Structure 1
Amino acid sequence: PALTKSQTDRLEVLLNPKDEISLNSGKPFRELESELLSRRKKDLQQIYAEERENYLGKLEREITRFFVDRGFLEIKSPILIPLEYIERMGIDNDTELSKQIFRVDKNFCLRPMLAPNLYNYLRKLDRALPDPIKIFEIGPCYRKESDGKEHLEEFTMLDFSQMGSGCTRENLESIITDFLNHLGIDFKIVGDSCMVFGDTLDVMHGDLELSSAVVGPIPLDREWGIDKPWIGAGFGLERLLKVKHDFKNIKRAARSESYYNGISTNL
């Protein structure tokens, strides 16, 4: 007959992009599932025998090397941050980002973004390091958005910043260009046409936003004690993974108990 929805869902979970098998012919739901199962089992086994690195962790280690080798300091800051940091980010309790905050206790939350801890480091480091100040962080970030397709509730941000001299948009577009060229991902920076400083740039791969990027100074810097030019960009690693491996669903790239390196773990 014709594959029911559960049979369709079940095969979509077992399918990978490299799979060539004819997913429409005379075979029952159930040759097809068994075939994919055998393919996905051999995929885990090959992983276990020859590689054994997690994709999310591996990409994290590769991005780290890129920025360290470019003069950027590697920051590991708290994931649990004061709720007051969200307030000085300008996310008041009527904005749309305001409703996506995982609160913990009364006073704390899971950081939805890396910027506020990075604002603080930039302020403290400016007392001890020579111009310009270049820092970056990679790590977990949380938001109650999960439209499922392009959006996770638990994801991994990269965020880098330069502060002081050299902080132009053509320098910022030159860092993003080397980064994505090193990753092997094509892009496409949209924004205002003749924007010098102050406004955001988007890094696109198709209809997929890989990053929002900022050419400071911006009025928010005063709330953080930052008084200096700066440029910076935030990238979601799961979207990057989605691009390199052609994942259909971004959940294939996330921290998970259901997928490992894009392979279903329910075999």
Structure 2
Amino acid sequence: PALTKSQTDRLEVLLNPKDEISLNSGKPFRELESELLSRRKKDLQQIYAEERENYLGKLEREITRFFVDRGFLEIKSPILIPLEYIERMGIDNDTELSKQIFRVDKNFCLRPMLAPNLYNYLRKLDRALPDPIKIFEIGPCYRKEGKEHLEEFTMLNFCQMGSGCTRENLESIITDFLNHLGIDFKIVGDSCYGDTLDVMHGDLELSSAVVGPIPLDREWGIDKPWIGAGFGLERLLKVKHDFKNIKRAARSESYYNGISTNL
């Protein structure tokens, strides 16, 4: 008897990218399932015996090291932010991203992006720190949203403001970063300040990057050249570990380092 679609779905939960097992050599479902359960249990046992690190935590630590070592100040800013910051980001009450915001009270929301707090840090730090100002943050962001989007995700955003804010410098930082992580990519932009660049892995967007200045800056009291980019950590993990589904890379009770916890 052929496997049912439901049975196949169940085995796929238990399958890890490089399992050499074949789902069509006569073995009944129960046997295939039992084999995969054994393997996934042994995977968790191995993590628990040796490293004990969560991939999302560990990636955050590796990225933090990378940016700190290259002169960028580590920021930890609020996750719960004023709703006014979203409007000030140019996201109107009729925009599609406006419908994706998780509101919390009359006045607050879960940040859907790192830009507003980083804008405020850039303005504030310009009074204390020498040119150029280099900062980054990694942490949770939220958007009401498939196989590439999560409602709860983790962004890296880095910024430089003042001298050296060129397209070439931005591309070089992106290039050093992803070659450090071991992640294949191409940078796409219309090749003729103002530019947005997409960092792609095949069809998957890893990042949107901006060469400022842009008109939005004045809303935030910023009037200097700047460059920056945001990367989703769950996307980076998905690519690095070859997960078929991004939910395997997320904060989750169903997956641990891309291993099913329903065993």
Query: TM tier, shorter chain?
Result: over 0.9
Aligned-partner SS, 2:213: coil
TM-score norm. by structure 1 comes to: 0.98
Shift of 1:24: 1.4
Q: Distance in 2 between matches of 1:23 and 1:174?
A: 44
2:44 partner SS: helix
How far did 1:193 drift? 1.4
Q: Structure 1 residue 5: deviation in Å?
A: 2.2
User: How far apart in 2 are the matches of 1:211 and 1:175?
Assistant: 13
Q: In the TM superposition, what is the alpha-carbon distance from 1:3 to its structure 2 partner?
A: 1.4
Q: Give the CA deviation at 1:186.
A: 1.1
For structure 1, the 5+ residue unaligned runs are none
Report the CA distance between 1:6 and its aligned residue: 1.9
Deviations 1:186-231 (A, max 9, x none): 110001112xx11210000100100000000000001000010000
How many residues align? The count is 263
2:163 is the counterpart of 1:165: yes
Which residue number corresponds to residue 14 of structure 2? 14
1:107-163 deviations in Å (ceiling 9; x for gaps): 000000000000000000000000000000000000001xx2000000000000000
The residue that corresponds to 2:255 in the other structure is: 259
Quick one: distance in 2 between partners of 1:192 and 1:6? 45
Q: Structure 2 CA distance, aligned partners of 1:78 and 1:26?
A: 55
Matches within 5 A, 1:91-110: 91-110=91-110
| Alpha-carbon distance in 2 for matches of 1:40, 1:149 | 22
Q: Does 1:220 align with 2:216?
A: yes
Moved more, 7-16 or 255-264: 7-16
CA distance in 2, matches of 1:91, 1:2: 51
Superposition RMSD in Å:
0.6
Which consecutive unaligned segments of at least 5 residues does structure 2 have?
none
Q: Distance in 1 between matches of 2:171 and 2:49?
A: 40
Query: C-alpha separation between the residues in 2 aligned to 1:170 and 1:187?
Result: 16
The structural deviation recorded for 1:2 is: 1.8
Deviation at 1:176, TM superposition (A): 0.2
TM-score normalised by the chain length of structure 2: 0.99
Q: Which of structure 1's runs of 4+ aligned residues deviate more than 3 A? A: none
Identity fraction in percent: 99
Displacement of 1:23 after TM fit? 1.1
> Whole-Å Cα distance in 2 between the matches of residues 6 and 266 of structure 1?
16
1:9 Cα deviation (Å)?
Answer: 1.2
* Residue 25 (structure 1) shift: 2.1
Greater shift, 93-102 or 173-182, is seen at 93-102
Partners of 1:199 and 1:174 in 2: how far apart? Answer: 15
